[PDB]
């Protein structure tokens, strides 16, 4: 049985834990977050403004947590090299702080006894990115101890892009993601951390906010065939969770929406089971809260100008979908030998 | 001096009156809305959740309103034919109820003595649509008594699309508008009137909602050279006002974002003054509340995959910009001979 | 097994159905809503913006619904007298349209063969109101075929007010409910139905809105001793569901927050089991989404100025709590003989 | 004519500057904020998600700001003792960081050459609190160099409470402020600064949140006659600005709503001109955006159980009202002799 440690018990951290508690093939044994004592961790696990009450029991046992009868070790270290992952029995670390997105910083977990690290974001350096159901089998345990699970937007775009490119071929494409607000945004107009993303510091609750994203370009790394063929941007909106990819692309081979839907349907029921999904219902964002899929094609929202120029709409719970993929990746990493 | 009568004193109706009160070449003399008495009309004009307190004075005088010391006649007729526009001295009618969008229905205003009618929406029939700064000079007063000012999204897309098509040429394009909520949407999950737009009946405050726009369906009629070359959809978001056009197009002639920006700049400073605008600041939706422009290019938000495949971002206050254009059109109609 | 018909398949109607599907002692056999065809009904049951996906199977069977294998007859009558409740097998009718809140109107269901009617609101006339755990045993089947379940705020206030009046006595009290938005409110500034409530017609998503509450007049009818001793108002806020009672009262006998907490705890574990609840956690509104209790005392939020003047805080899911009580009442009504 | 320096260029900091720009008897000459450079300061002043575009011109002139032709010196010091206020010619410092709320910390501005300091919050120590129109004349320049303008809620509650206590007498009272979100709240579920106030770290956009208010302890210090007779709490809601005081109190002398309204009217037109206001319109929160008053009585929303037990409703723009008062206090302080 694979074991997990979580660094940064935030939106992704807590939902990764929730996903692990639902599974027999992986166990959470340790959590680290210096901005959060044990009682606070219990509170933030028990209660969730988006995903409801924790399904199970959460108690404080001295310095640690007792979750569903299992002991989970709790630490409050600011530096990753201070956390005793090995002694806690944690083989794999979910690096979900948002502040250690390089090999240099994320590899500090290995000093504490960790065997492997998964950065819950695209890296700032050349740490390899893997998307489950797309390129995860490319992972080489002899060459990497620190890997990345990319972004939730990449996890939404890449499986759809693979299906479309395999079947019809993408000549060129531009993506917008209409994305729910995140932790780096602010409740009222203020300065963004580092002063880099000025728009992201504007009142999150009443604004439509343009944003940059490398997600579409990152698909060019996950799927080398699409290097230089895809890019895009983000538009941030006041909703607390769930986002949607809007992909406008030109196809090398003509295809109708129905044919695109069928290609997605066959992948969803076959090689991309549990990763790619589809719907023909009149869905809205809240309908996907808690959805474990990486990408859900919205048939009725797709539009075609002609047989070669199309706009594809795909949903994703940026919190829940991604968290389940990270857990999938951890389980897969363990199966390849630690 | 043109005189205006307003049918449907709603979001557009009330902001059209506000735009008139700012101008010396047009006067509002009559208002009809059967779902609000004079006291209620006074209240809804005085107070606005988006555009602030009315700039001036509003008083009830008997059965009518006194706005900035001027008498404005008030009626409560469900039937357009029953409104005495002529006896009230109203030459042009702003048809902004949302329920009389055909020549057959909108022409009923002519029975009461109105000379011309402007439908505040795209028509359900073949009523001619005009967009200020694009095709408005094509209006023939001897041919048409009922015209349309199209939609707010059309007024955003058409000026930009014309500029791009003229200098670079649009081979093919697809658009999305990330659009603020409107009066037809619902506060909680319920049935949409007529039971047609199921998604639009879902809780507006916490949902990202795919929708229709018919704006590129309208831009093709306003700019015949683009008919069949553009289509689009909408994504409805919880914000109370201000929307954004996201236009992804292939260009006939290669162009950089800088060159595109320069073309928009030249049009904004010349033939499309007051209609097309541009910015290089890190703006968000609230920054455009009250903005009178039809279309504002967001330079920093635009992205290009290559020299001939681009995603262009243009803002619009769907309430304020459109209302100002409708008043512009009414003044223009009056100048052509009533 | 009691059988239920639902008139008005709205927020309350649908959640009443959901509450029944969770139960073995009551079954929904018929639904009536003229503004909603059977396909739309299926859609609105399947998907909920607050309470998630329907847990079960919903299919259209002719003009009727098939839910978890059972046929639920569907009608589209505007006139209650035209609904064949008897032929459908429906014993008790949930009157949840919001427009038939008198004995004269609600008794029309009896013409179609229904035995009993529960109005899902305070009546406009003298139809008796019952609150589970407070006065429901005063119901007399030989006297009344039409009854009321009061309001959600009444169901929150009444159990708490009873506990306080029994143990300590209420000299006088004033309350406010900070209340989530409802169906009667509007997405943008517009006219409310009729002359009623101008404030309620203001943009729901960005306003704090003073309002009225049914519990102001209902509480003194449910607990006659408090008639003239207790009244209040509402403050409407942008949240989609869950509300909170803010009760400020003078006690006839000295009591601390601890003593008040204990009295509530005793009632919650005794005669008001499943109805009155309590918490000592740092809860917020979303933590109560789906909560079945009528009233949950928030210990940490309560404040005492002195030993006889106190502010009590009590949560309630205005949709889920009330819907469960109406079903509780229906089961109780059937147990008394139809 | 006073000169002002601003420490902490946040919501209050920037709106204090905006208030100053509207007046000719006070001038901002310096700003310190280590979390934003001069370009970022210019951006956050120019654009506001609540209060609109800045009325005037904002230019970056090398190191410093040029606002309406006036040079404003810009600093980036974390330590208040390192800011050269004297060299910049700043007489009075607006201490609006939220982190220097003691005499020991706030008096550090005097080291850099400032003459007086106004903390934009209730102090953690015994620094004297003043509310304009309530107790500001008790200020003596020969006694204090460091003072406090209390809080926004204190500035709403105190004038109202004074009027009622002077006219009728408050025996006992409890209040709640339904309060817009602030900078200390979070966009999604997370850990609050420090480690306490867990509820304030919950998703601000979709929650009703019990909270603390500065006015609970401050009101009894500003009006000593009400010490131990008045306290309360806050309820935080998703709106970006504007809050409302809900005051439930018992009176020593019988008084109707009309009599209370007339007493407020007298004060508003007399000793509390520009501080206390009143309305009989069906107002909602957005109607007070930019309102300069400290407290606006909502006549229609007030309720009386009997002639001596009453609930009073008073609005305030927590940003605009308070900011104008701090500027009023700075001007008053200057008039008394620096
Ligand atoms: N939609 C999403 O939220 C989403 C989806 C996919 C990936 N991600 C990525 O996952 C990462 C975290 O995202 P999030 O939304 O959960 O942010 P978050 O703010 O909710 O969680 C971050 C947690 O890290 C903790 N932390 C900060 N410094 C730490 C340290 N030095 N050591 C240990 N813990 C520390 C913080 O206390 C916080 O609880 C980011 O890289 C983000 O880009 C986010
Ligand atoms: N962003 C926008 O809101 C926007 C922008 C451009 C165009 N439009 C179009 O303008 C029209 C109105 O839009 P809105 O947002 O102002 O809607 P609205 O609901 O705010 O206003 C419609 C008004 O019409 C009144 N009305 C209904 N029946 C009437 C009748 N029989 N006679 C007179 N008045 C009647 C209603 O009482 C209401 O006040 C629609 O066609 C809409 O598509 C809207
Ligand atoms: N928090 C709440 O939502 C809440 C809580 C307690 C009680 N209530 C009360 O319950 C009632 C319904 O409230 P709601 O929030 O569900 O409103 P709603 O608008 O969501 O539901 C009302 C339903 O009644 C239907 N309807 C209208 N006329 C009808 C008719 N003639 N015949 C059959 N159906 C008709 C409408 O189509 C709609 O689906 C109201 O009386 C309300 O005061 C509401
Ligand atoms: N409704 C309100 O916002 C409101 C109303 C009345 C009073 N207040 C009080 O006013 C103060 C500021 O509140 P705010 O809402 O403007 O918060 P804010 O976060 O918007 O502003 C605080 C500013 O202080 C700056 N800052 C932090 N450390 C600094 C330092 N060491 N030196 C100089 N600047 C520093 C931050 O960068 C930020 O720009 C708080 O004490 C608050 O309680 C707030
Ligand atoms: O957490 C902030 C990230 O920008 C979210 O992006 P993502 O949803 O693409 O991972
Ligand atoms: O609500 C309607 C829009 O403001 C008008 O534009 P659209 O319908 O073309 O998107
Ligand atoms: O929607 C209204 C409430 O849920 C019902 O209770 P109230 O009317 O007594 O506040
Ligand atoms: O807007 C007000 C500030 O957030 C603090 O005020 P308060 O603590 O007195 O409510
Ligand atoms: Mg991303
Ligand atoms: Mg059942």
Numbering used by the authors:
A (entry chain D), B (entry chain C), C (entry chain B), D (entry chain A): 2 to 339
Sentences from the paper on this structure:
GAPDH plays an essential role in glycolysis by catalyzing the reversible two step oxidative phosphorylation of D-glyceraldehyde 3-phosphate (D-G3H) into 1,3-diphosphoglycerate using NAD (or NADP) as a cofactor. GAPDHs exist as a homotetrameric protein. We have determined the crystal structure of C. parvum GAPDH (CpGAPDH) in a substrate free state (apo), in the NAD-bound state (holo) and in a ternary complex with NAD and D-G3H. The asymmetric unit in the crystal structure contains one tetramer of CpGAPDH with subunits related by 222 non-crystallographic symmetry.
In order to form the ternary complex with the physiological substrate, the nucleophilic cysteine residue of the active site (C153), was substituted with serine following the strategy employed by Didierjean et al to form the ternary complex of BsGAPDH. Although a racemic mixture of L- and D-G3H was used to prepare the ternary complex, only the D-enantiomer was bound to each molecule of the tetramer. In CpGAPDH subunits A, B and C the substrate binds with the C-3 phosphate in the classical 'new Pi site' as defined by Kim et al. The phosphate oxygen atoms form hydrogen bonds with residues G215 (N), T154 (OG1), S152 (OG), A216 (N) and T214 (OG1). Upon substrate binding a significant change occurs in subunits A, B and to a lesser extent in C in the region from residues 213 to 225, which includes the last residue in a β-strand, two residues that connect the strand to a helix, and the beginning of an α-helix. However, this stretch of the polypeptide chain in subunit D of the ternary complex remains in the same conformation as in the apo and holoenzyme structures.
